[PDB]
Write a protein that binds this ligand. Structure first.
Ligand SMILES: Cc1cc2nc3c(=O)[nH]c(=O)nc-3n(C[C@H](O)[C@H](O)[C@H](O)COP(=O)(O)OP(=O)(O)OC[C@H]3O[C@@H](n4cnc5c(N)ncnc54)[C@H](O)[C@@H]3O)c2cc1C
Ligand SMILES: Cc1cc2nc3c(=O)[nH]c(=O)nc-3n(C[C@H](O)[C@H](O)[C@H](O)COP(=O)(O)OP(=O)(O)OC[C@H]3O[C@@H](n4cnc5c(N)ncnc54)[C@H](O)[C@@H]3O)c2cc1C
Ligand code: MET
Ligand code: MET
Lengths: 684, 684
């Protein structure tokens, strides 16, 4: 039941509604332009040219094409990253980034004839990521081919935790080297306890609406559900799940599930010899390293159960590639499509400038101010009708948090501590303006943004001949070499990905893709930050040798007399010397890879997700919207950035229409009215 | 009531027992040598010359002095840090480190006449840290003066969160600028809920033995508790607390407490406009930035409630300085005292070598093997009777996890991925040998160690004239300048500490002391890792300007209508150009600052804490002990390192006596027998 084209994936997920936005299918809302604007010549800024900002630009283009003769939209897009595709009309990165969609091209002097691509950020896309595939269809067409991402379990995989080794494909014991594996048994216990059954008895530990999550996922994905059922999920049942479980970590939930299974006898004592608590702990940690289909979630054990449950409902692990050589092409293509679809009514200019501050000021028609610095640190100020702040939360904080929380007669804004020039604004209000009369409302949005959790992440890459997989010491599953390795060696998750520039001579050896503490533990060895090599011609050889050295472990396989050094050490050492690489998102200006919510974080992230509803408060007249995966319930997915972009543009339309929701299309209106408003007073 | 000398502190905490070791006061155990050894000439290694390793050395010296004529102990102490005090027998660090006890001396060319000291690691010591003050008396005498550490609230303090500003000293509202402050109300709610009352009614939300923690704290600190009370805590009531609450984060607990208080009306809606969950979240986040006496615990919100409760029971925030110019002096003095107390029966040699591997091997008497590399990267192998591994968990992992989990005929150990020379060992068993028959048992200890959580931390320092505090632009409160700033600016916690080289002309401006995500958010700006400057003659000016710039915020105060840039911006910018500094523990080889347990981590950390009980199994030939704050229930405190060292030496005594617990002193026996054993052996 594997999808083979963009269109097949698109249609698969077209219906799916996430539990915090259960009254709308975002793909359906995005099918037609989101609404209508009054006649005018608008001046809009988008800060950030990543997935969020470019999707927002695309939707603005669609709106622009609907405007009457004499009307139009001008967009200034600010993009600070010198490597952005926006500024481009051995390891090469220049022109190959669109924020956290980021490719590194490995070549030997001629970039048009490369060896492989490292996908440094986004790489694998859920089947039911309906908005993702909607935009992929706009970019590439429905007919374009897609492939199954080679996740652990999708290709032959070796798993190592402590003394346990497994070699497997999927979850059918017939496809496991050891069909009696305790790993496969604990997977069944934890999946049963978290997901349960779509039919029959409820067996999950943490019900939603008194039933297993699998049953709720089928309603959220229904090709037609009760409207009433969706409303009750939105307003009652998902909120009640949050109230109960937002304070429970994933790690705690796994331990509860394993404890009950152990007490029932479904899981036996480990070795026959560990005591009760040691056995439970062993299983918790074993599952921790194994995961849900994308490698161990041990490093993610501090996320709320609520956050994990979003991913469960979404069947997140069932993922595909894009029909591209480099994922940045998706975003580049959407940028071009935006301009095409505006039909001449959208004009776009790119600024290679870092925004330092946003505010509302003055008494002119355009009051939405941006203060920015160019690549030689010259200051620039511009006023706009509307602004979309399409940057993740730690990048947004300095822009929105340094102006205070209420009216100020005058402020000299900018990066004065850097020695840079400031600019005087008069009659100043915060950019994220939730009240004329509460500094606390203005402070709540800013403080929430600034305390969202950016998960840490890093990727270590090298280039290897694909034929290295045919060495006699590389294990096989039914004649196919092992191509994914999930391990407690410190590397966490490793992938031998065939080059997309093509059977390819080379593969991208994703030696280590780490999250959270797994990333922290490596970071001292990266050498140069955020990228080693920092130059096009260097190689991160010393760093990479420390990764090879982590793999230099004696591994015992069942039936063998003695342990020998792990074969995967030999595989890593087969990578060529040149083009060894690490990128540390943690030491990038993003301050990490992507948002993941901790216990208690729902209320912070959800405030951000609902922020665009400020447009309902007509007199407030707030001109700023936010658009990033940080302002979604899908941090770490293009789907989240795209949802947030859709929210931002929907809100912008309502604000341009002075609070009138009838300006949104029928299908888009629930983007605004299906959420609890962020402004209680005034109503609207 | 305030302790004024080492002896007064020592005596204050002499009886205190931690809840995971409730049967024993470690200082009482340590009052005499821990036990006796058979006659012999012992060859022992200590890996690591930090607080754990040196306290272990001291206790081995105490033991050595008791040996008869012709007997003795030889210790090889391995210390890889080139800046260790052990290898020394503008910003200078050479010779000023004892692991995470780490000083930076600021001077102008003559290091004998410095300006100030930056305490880069340990700096503030709880009054009831009884073992810390026990060793401080060994090093300095009881008469040595100590000072109250200038924590937020101990000195005039400014607190900033969102739109909220407070200026205060203490918890008496008479000395808050706003006695009606919401910050003081939430603090009182969160204290009632977590700590409760030492007398009368129980009001706390999370009881221990059905009573408030404050009541249990008193029992744990009592010279003579009631009969059976400590046993019941140890075996019943504290285990039951863990079973209930080890799956609950601190942040979740705070929100539960706040929710109940908001529903009761103790905490009002924040604005005329914040809804229920918004007001609740505001108070949770307000308290999160304020803290318990040492700055905001928001970054620590993912710790288990169990871990916070340990700190509550210990009154952890009531802290002092040591009687030194640099805290490294404490560890240096202890090292010299170890040699003195050995009475010529302890011989110590220091090796400037990095240990790469430990194992048991061969057939000779001394079977505990260490493989190391010197400063020329030449390999060394040495065999010992016993080894104490006195390094934190991420540094221990490569040493103990790469030899598998059962017998191997031979292994070529070492850092082969680095291209370094290996050494062949024959008849090899893992170093952390919990079982002769169960790889899973051996895997549980290794995998536990490798998955402990090392909290991230960083410190930004500069040098400022103390007289800067007397400028009209620095606020005064209750007769003194503000000297502590706790803020949501990104800096987290800031201190203006008078120089200890002396009123002093200079102060150490600890501009930012961050934990966890607060540290992550800054890390991209550090420039050089782990230390900027990397040289003695440089200054981290560019880095520091990014911190000054985070302080360039317009702050509205009650006392002035026109908000201005935060005064603290001016103070930070008053620091001199030279000697600006950051140290990032996260990018140090420790991979962070210190252990803090997440939900579920009790089972891992407590396994480590109990590991030395392997000595009870006489048939098990395990020569290795561990000694670090990572293997304690006080990660982030010298007390934890010292407790773990006491455990290690107690276990070593029992192992050297082939399982005979009677070889421990009466007072030290419970260090082994008061814990659940990690190996099953017969009763009594
Ligand atoms: C390691 C990693 C793995 C991932 N895995 C997947 C995956 O497999 N599948 C998936 O769907 N998603 C994945 N993601 C998530 C995906 O990459 C993001 O959700 C998405 O790219 C974020 O888009 P955004 O617009 O929110 O932010 P960003 O991509 O961060 O874009 C923001 C843009 O704003 C610019 N900018 C920032 N601050 C300023 C400023 N002050 N002035 C001007 N310009 C500024 C930046 O330079 C950047 O181009 C992954 C990401 C990472 C890092
Ligand atoms: C930012 C920070 C703040 C802190 N605040 C306080 C505080 O105010 N009060 C308090 O009581 N405590 C505090 N602590 C905690 C205190 O510093 C530690 O508990 C204690 O110093 C840890 O001692 P240790 O022996 O466990 O480990 P370490 O200090 O880490 O010492 C281990 C030693 O082993 C060496 N080593 C490591 N690996 C090898 C190897 N392979 N071969 C050879 N040598 C090796 C290291 O170089 C090091 O010298 C703080 C620590 C930090 C970092
Ligand atoms: C949020 S899940 C982790 C990040 C990313 N979506 C991945 O699959 O790697
Ligand atoms: C564990 S609490 C945090 C580290 C250290 N004890 C401090 O007081 O800063």
């Amino acid at each position: 039941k594997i999808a083979t084209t963009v269109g097949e994936a698109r249609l698969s997920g077209i219906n799916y509604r996430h539990p915090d936005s259960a009254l709308v299918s975002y793909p359906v809302a995005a099918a037609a332009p989101l609404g209508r604007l009054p006649a005018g010549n608008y001046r809009i800024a988008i800060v950030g040219g990543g997935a969020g900002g470019i999707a927002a630009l695309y939707e603005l283009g669609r709106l622009a094409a609907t405007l009457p003769a004499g009307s139009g939209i001008d967009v200034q897009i600010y993009e600070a990253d010198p490597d952005s595709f926006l500024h481009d009309r051995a390891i090469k990165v220049r022109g190959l980034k669109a924020g956290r969609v980021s490719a590194a091209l490995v070549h030997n002097g001629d970039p048009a004839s490369g060896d492989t691509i490292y996908e440094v950020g986004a790489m694998r896309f859920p089947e039911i990521a309906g908005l993702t595939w909607h935009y992929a269809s706009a970019a590439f067409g429905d007919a374009a081919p897609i492939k199954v991402f080679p996740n652990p379990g999708k290709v032959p995989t070796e798993f190592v935790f402590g003394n346990r080794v497994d070699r497997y494909v999927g979850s059918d014991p017939k496809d496991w080297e050891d069909p009696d594996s305790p790993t496969l048994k604990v997977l069944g216990v934890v999946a049963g306890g978290l997901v349960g059954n779509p039919q029959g008895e409820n067996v999950a530990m943490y019900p939603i609406a008194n039933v297993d999550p699998a049953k709720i996922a089928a309603i959220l994905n229904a090709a037609t559900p009760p409207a009433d059922a969706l409303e009750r999920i939105q307003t009652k049942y998902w909120p009640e799940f949050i109230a109960q479980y937002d304070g429970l970590t994933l790690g705690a939930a796994v331990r509860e599930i394993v404890t009950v299974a152990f007490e029932k006898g479904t899981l036996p004592p480990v070795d026959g010899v560990l005591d009760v608590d040691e056995s439970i702990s062993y299983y918790v940690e074993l599952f921790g390293r194994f995961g849900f289909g994308t490698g161990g979630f041990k490093p993610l054990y501090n996320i709320s159960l609520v956050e994990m449950m979003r991913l469960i409902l979404w069947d997140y692990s069932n993922e595909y590639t894009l029909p591209v050589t480099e994922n940045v092409e998706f975003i580049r293509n959407l940028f071009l499509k935006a301009q095409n679809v505006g039909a001449g009514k959208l004009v776009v200019q790119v600024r290679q400038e870092r925004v330092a501050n946003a505010c509302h000021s003055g008494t002119a028609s355009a009051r939405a101010q941006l203060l920015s610095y160019d690549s030689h640190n010259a200051v620039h100020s511009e006023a706009y009708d509307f602004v979309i702040l399409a940057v993740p939360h730690d990048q947004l904080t300095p822009i929105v948090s340094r102006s205070g929380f209420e009216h100020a007669a005058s402020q000299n804004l900018g990066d004065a501590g850097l020695g840079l020039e400031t600019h005087t604004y008069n009659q100043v209000y915060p950019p994220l303006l939730l009240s004329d009369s509460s500094p606390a409302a203005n402070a709540r949005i800013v403080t929430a943004i600034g305390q969202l959790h950016m998960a840490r992440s890093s990727k270590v890459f090298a280039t290897v001949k694909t034929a290295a997989l045919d060495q006699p010491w590389v294990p096989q599953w039914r004649g196919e070499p092992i191509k994914a390795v999930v391990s407690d060696s410190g590397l966490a998750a490793s992938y031998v990905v065939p080059s997309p520039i093509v059977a390819p001579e080379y593969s991208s050896l994703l030696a280590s893709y780490t999250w959270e503490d797994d990333s922290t533990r490596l970071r001292h060895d990266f050498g140069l930050y955020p990228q080693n090599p920092a130059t096009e011609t260097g190689t991160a050889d010393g760093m990479y040798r420390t990764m090879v050295n982590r793999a230099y472990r004696y591994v015992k396989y069942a039936g063998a007399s003695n342990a020998q050094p792990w074969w995967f050490y030999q595989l890593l050492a087969e990578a060529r010397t040149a083009d060894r690489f690490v990128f540390d998102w943690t030491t990038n200006k993003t301050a990490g890879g992507f948002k993941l919510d901790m216990t208690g974080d729902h209320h912070q992230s959800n405030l951000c997700f609902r922020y665009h509803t400020h447009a309902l408060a007509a007199s407030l007249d707030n001109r700023f919207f936010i658009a990033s995966d940080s302002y979604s319930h899908l941090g770490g997915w293009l789907e989240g950035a795209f949802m947030s972009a859709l929210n931002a543009v929907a809100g912008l339309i309502v604000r341009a229409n002075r609070g009138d929701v009838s300006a949104l299309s029928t299908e888009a209106r629930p983007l605004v009215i299906g959420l609890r408003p962020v402004v209680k007073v005034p109503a609207a």
